């Protein structure tokens, strides 16, 4: 499935503050009105149907625009690296429901890594359970841990309440991450609207990463038996992936220093004039 990412994918090119100015820059951005691949989730049980739990590996290319909508925090994290063989260092960003953890280590990943949570009937609480991202870790260059907040453990489907936009690109060894969180009321596709992605982290990994893959989580309620047979729920969530390309953009800085709008001068003849 394909959707159109109308305006989205714009993040601040740099730290520099500007005001009431139009600053042109060339950086890797998602093109406007680009075509985005749509991935869908509802893990398939033994029975088959519309159900799909898509955890494919995707190309890193120029960098990846990642967007996800979540009813119930299905998507735990991502993997970045060439092989993911445990041959070399790779990036593992996962939220183990308790904290965000980042590890560079040479992890061994399973064929189909995923998370699962299980809920016991005796106690009414959703806790994580099955976790099979990595067998073992090799040497580790860097490790990071983050806040204690919790994530949505159950497979609850409904209008997508939240939107989390991320841009991953590694330039010069630096793995840059940008993000933005907003509430949304829309199941089908990305909302049409413009918003920036402020940079959260800059990691010095300096590893060459060819490809990446997303990680999802399972959600089990009390009713379910713990087993891996068919007691698990992937949830409603879906995510989108686009690819950045070197383009020129005109960024409009407001008085605040926040960017209200942008023009993709590559897009249309009207746009081309705007940059000039």
């Amino acid at each position, epitope marked *: 499935a394909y959707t159109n990412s109308f305006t989205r994918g714009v993040y601040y090119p740099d730290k520099v503050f500007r005001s009431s100015v139009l600053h042109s820059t060339q950086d890797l951005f998602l093109p406007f009105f680009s075509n985005v691949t749509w991935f869908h989730a509802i893990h398939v049980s033994g029975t088959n149907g519309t159900k799909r739990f898509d955890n494919p590996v995707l190309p890193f290319n120029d960098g990846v625009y990642f967007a996800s909508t979540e009813k119930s925090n299905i998507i735990r994290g991502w993997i970045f690296g060439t092989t993911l063989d445990s041959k070399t260092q790779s990036l593992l960003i996962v939220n183990n429901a308790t904290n965000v953890v980042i590890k560079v280590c040479e992890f061994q990943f399973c064929n189909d890594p995923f998370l699962g949570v299980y809920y016991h009937k005796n106690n009414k609480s959703w806790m994580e359970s099955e976790f099979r991202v990595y067998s073992s870790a090799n040497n580790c260059t860097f490790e990071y841990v983050s806040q204690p907040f919790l994530m949505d453990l159950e497979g609850k489907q409904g*209008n997508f309440k939240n939107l989390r936009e991320f841009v991953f690109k590694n330039i010069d060894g630096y793995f840059k991450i940008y993000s933005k969180h907003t509430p949304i009321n*829309l199941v*089908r596709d990305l909302p049409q609207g413009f918003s920036a992605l402020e940079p959260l982290v800059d990691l010095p990994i300096g590893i060459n990463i060819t490809r990446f893959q997303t990680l999802l989580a399972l959600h089990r309620s009390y009713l379910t038996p713990g087993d891996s047979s068919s007691g698990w729920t992937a949830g409603a969530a879906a995510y989108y992936v686009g690819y950045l390309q070197p383009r020129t953009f005109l960024l409009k800085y407001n008085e605040n220093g926040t960017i209200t709008d942008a023009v993709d001068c590559a897009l249309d003849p009207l746009s081309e004039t705007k940059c000039t």
Partner: antibody
Amino acid sequence: EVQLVESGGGLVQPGGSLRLSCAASGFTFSSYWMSWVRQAPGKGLEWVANINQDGSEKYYVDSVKGRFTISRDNAKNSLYLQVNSLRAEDTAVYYCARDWDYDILTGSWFGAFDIWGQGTTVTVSS
Amino acid sequence: DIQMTQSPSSLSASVGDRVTITCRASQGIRNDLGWYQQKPGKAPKRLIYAASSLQSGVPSRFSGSGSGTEFTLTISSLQPEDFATYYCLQHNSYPLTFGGGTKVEIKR
């Protein structure tokens, strides 16, 4: 042949409870989303809830959230809309309705309601 | 969310005459729109889905067209049976929404 019948209904006081069943026949029940819809007397149509084929994903209108629970028994061929805690505004008729097409298909007609029951009336009053 | 606004809210026409009720989407629906016919107490019957498709058992007098955000349900030759309220609905995105409804009346 193809028939869907609502059930339950009846009056109960506010903060009351009702379990509207909906029996379906004439089609492969497990493959179609089902939908409750209400029409207060004098008012226009308002969609209540929907449930996906697998029975996992369920959606509700805001007014209803927490109050009503849409259940399903593909084996049973029944709809179950559990209602608590009833309000006056809740008075209306409830129709269970078929989606069109297969829930499986990418081209999804499921939102289109091709078949409807007669309805059931729920009256909430002292 | 999206709001569907039908117009006119009510109309009166003679038997054979052609009637056109329009529905306007606040947001671009694409063609995820359906039309339903409802009689006073009775439950609604689906007239059209996918904007153009007629559903089985409906007369050709009923037709539906649409492009962009605006859609139209036309009834080529009004019949007395046709008395009812007609509603448009958009299945495009959640929540599903119905228009206000247009009451049709037989001019006499």
